[PDB]
Amino acid sequence: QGPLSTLIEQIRFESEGLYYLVKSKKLPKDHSGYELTTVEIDLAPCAALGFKQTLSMGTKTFSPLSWFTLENGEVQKKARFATRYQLDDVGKLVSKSIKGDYIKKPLYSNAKNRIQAIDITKESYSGFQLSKVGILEQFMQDLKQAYGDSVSVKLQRIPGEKHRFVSDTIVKNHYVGLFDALKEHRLVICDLTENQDTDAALTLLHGIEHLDINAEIAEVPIRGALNILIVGNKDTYKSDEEDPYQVYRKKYQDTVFQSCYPERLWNRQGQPNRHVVEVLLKELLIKLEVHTRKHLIEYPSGPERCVYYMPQRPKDESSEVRDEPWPVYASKLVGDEWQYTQATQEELEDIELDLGNDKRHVFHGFERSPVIYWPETGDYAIFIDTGIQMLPEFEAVAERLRELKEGRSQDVPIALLAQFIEENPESKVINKLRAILSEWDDVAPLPFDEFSTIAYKSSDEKQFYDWLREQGFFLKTSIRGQSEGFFNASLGFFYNREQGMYFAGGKGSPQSKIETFSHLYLIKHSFDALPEEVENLFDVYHLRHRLPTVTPYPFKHLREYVEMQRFRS
DNA sequence: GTTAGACTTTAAGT
DNA sequence: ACTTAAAGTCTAACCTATAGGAT
DNA sequence: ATCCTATAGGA
Ligand SMILES: [Mg+2]
């Protein structure tokens, strides 16, 4: 049919939401109890697809409230009621207490513990069973063991037509072209913080230099050139006249600006973080494309006669649910350039009727969605995140992994290794077998760990592991194969122009440790036949960094236009 | 004010 | 007491070995 | 025969 998705075809802490204890951490000194990190499996309504049910996987930390207990024995007022859940011994079959001090809040104010989605790192079923896909696999198998096929949940696959994969070579070429485009423009870094003792400017310059891009450090920001400012945190300053950010950015209006904190330029291990450099550079490129109203790299072709509208949220107060008409900014492709203007009241009066039923994605609220419109016929196109998560085919991956664990449970006899050495004298795997047999002793068999010097890469190694498999010793196998395709719906650009629906994801090969699910996007329309060039609007690989994108390319350009207006009007 | 996208905790609406 | 949207946190943004097809 | 370029399994 196509890729898998959380949309539903047919319909353990024991409450609303099925918690699966994943991780436990011990508290610091002078405290008792364990912090819990948990995964929730729940069935929820859909906002974007006709109230058809959806699956939801979500981290729900549980902490002890003895952490919050004061020195005098009193307990802090932060949510001191109505939340009582605790664990017993095993991660399932637990209990609570209506006056229990073990709550759903984290250890701190708004700390967000997070859990991986898929883990097949050493293709270990134990590491797999501690990720969201693994928890969902456990959920399905527990439901199956509990009820037979009487109670079953069937994720609705997506009708798939145009599944445009992307390789690491294509994205690598896209970014070498991108940074080649940046080579034409002057780039400046300036550190403006108080008592510049952190030397973050040197680290950022050295990070840029390894992408072969020239940058020069100066004392103060320079007009005309692309600027990077290391300024302190936003809340460090109290007055907007003394904050270097936005005084240097309202002093100069027609100048491209990117700014950074010091702390962001280093990782946990102390080496430079080289991703920050790339994101800064490509974001400056996008802002420059916005600012000169052209394209510095070849974007695809947009649909003809289309217009892209996008609101912006004021810096004002309640109007309770932003009911007051926001400014709305429009973008059009005209010849060799783009036009960005503000949408007048007459245009939006026409639009709110021509868009009609689907007006309320552009108006009435926060997060007002950009929408394409067509002057010629009043047909339009809306791109909305549906809340649907799309999953790699978990049941097959777990079916493979359980058999891998069963195979590695046995120890290979010396007799089989001797037979394999005798019967295949020209294979390259023999030398490692002879060495590991000489290191071993002829009485006891070899466990799997001493095979760790032998990998499932070469063709003779593949033959060796298949030959071990025919004897019942299923040591290693193939899981992330493109030809066999279990880890799709997490890879590459997808497209269904009959229904506009799409998603993005990883590039090239799946990773053993992937921790986010892609989201399916819906293009609501009044069309009978959607324009073909809606394919082209987001076959671009640098909005999301080094990845396929879920939002059309003119929308980000319009948004970086809008954000550039805070210091002009 | 690394960013987009996904994601989780908190706060406002009911 | 429950709901849902708004506010805010946070992690990846791969890497290298092997076979195969082309020249 | 040899060098590049997909395939995907380890760090
Ligand atoms: Mg920004």
Give how far Cα A220 sits from Cα of A138, A248, A463, A567, Å: 57, 9, 64, 19
Same domain, A106 and A198: no
Question: How far is residue A165 CA from its own chain's centroid?
Answer: 17
- In single-letter form, the type of residue at position A258 comes to Q
C-beta separation of A283 from A179 below 8 A: no
Same domain, A67 and A124: yes
Q: With b meaning 16 or more CB within 10 Å and e meaning fewer, what string describes A50-60?
A: eeebbbebeeb
Give how far Cα A492 sits from Cα of A160, A171, A489, Å: 13, 11, 8
Cα–ligand 1 centroid distance for A560 (angstroms): 8
Spacing of A48 CA from C4 C1' in Å: 14
* Helix or strand (DSSP H, E) at A353: helix A345-354
In a domain, A386, yes or no: no
| Domain extent for A407 | 395-470
SS (H, E, C) A62-110: EEEHHHCECCCCCECCCCCCCCCCCCCCCCCCCCCCCCCCEECCCCCCC
C-beta separation of A498 from A475 below 8 A: no
The pairing of strands A216-218 and A187-191 is parallel
Same domain, A189 and A95: no
| Eight-state DSSP code of residue A448 | G
Spacing of A237 CA from D4 C1' in Å: 55
Q: Which two tokens stand for residue A241?
A: 């006249």
Q: Among A261, A291, A321, which residue terminates a domain?
A: A291
Please tell me whether any atom of strand C lies within 7 Å of the Cβ of A66. Answer: no
C-alpha to C-alpha distance for A281 and A542, rounded to whole angstroms: 11
C-beta separation of A217 from A205 below 8 A: yes
Q: Is the backbone of residue A363 left (phi > 0), alpha (psi -120 to 50) or beta?
A: beta
For A239, residues 6+ apart whose C-beta sits below 8 A from its C-beta are: none
Cα–ligand 1 centroid distance for A196 (angstroms): 23
In a domain, A489, yes or no: no
In a domain, A171, yes or no: no
In a domain, A84, yes or no: yes
Same domain, A23 and A110: yes
Q: Which residues pair with A75 in a beta bridge?
A: A69
Same domain, A121 and A25: yes
Same domain, A36 and A92: yes
Give how far Cα A442 sits from Cα of A413, A423, A429, A437, A447, Å: 9, 20, 19, 8, 13
Q: With b meaning 16 or more CB within 10 Å and e meaning fewer, what string describes A144-179?
A: eeeeeeeeebebbbbeeeebeebeeeebeebbeebb
- Nearest nt (C1') from A516 Cα: B6
Q: Which two tokens stand for residue A71?
A: 């020195």
C-alpha to C-alpha distance for A550 and A543, rounded to whole angstroms: 9
Give how far Cα A541 sits from Cα of A166, A292, A336, A494, A504, Å: 9, 21, 22, 13, 10
In a domain, A532, yes or no: no
Residue A338, helix vs strand vs coil: strand
Domain count, chain A: 3
Q: Among A452, A470, A488, which residue terminates a domain?
A: A470
Same domain, A141 and A66: yes
Question: How far is residue A46 CA from its own chain's centroid?
Answer: 21
In a domain, A562, yes or no: no
Spacing of A62 CA from C7 C1' in Å: 21
In a domain, A154, yes or no: no
Question: How far is residue A456 CA from its own chain's centroid?
Answer: 29
Cα–ligand 1 centroid distance for A281 (angstroms): 12
In a domain, A333, yes or no: no
- In single-letter form, the type of residue at position A213 comes to I
- Residue where the block lists tokens 């390789």: A167
C-beta separation of A23 from A115 below 8 A: yes
Cα–ligand 1 centroid distance for A183 (angstroms): 21
Q: Which bases of chain D are under 7 A from a protein CB atom?
A: 5-11
Same domain, A226 and A112: no
Same domain, A122 and A200: no
Residue A430 neighbours by CB distance under 10 Å = 17
Spacing of A335 CA from B2 C1' in Å: 33
CATH number, domain containing residue A287: 3.40.50
- Nearest nt (C1') from A456 Cα: D9
Expressed in Å, this structure's resolution amounts to 3.1
Same domain, A31 and A128: yes
Spacing of A304 CA from C9 C1' in Å: 40
Same domain, A213 and A110: no
C-beta separation of A417 from A432 below 8 A: no
DSSP for A213-268?
A: ---EEESS--SSSEEEEE---GGG-S-TTT-HHHHHHHH-SSS-EEEE-SGGGB-T
- CA angle centred on A307, ends A302 and A313, rounded to 5°: 120
- Residue where the block lists tokens 């990070």: A207
Q: Among A120, A147, A174, which residue terminates a domain?
A: A147
Same domain, A101 and A211: no
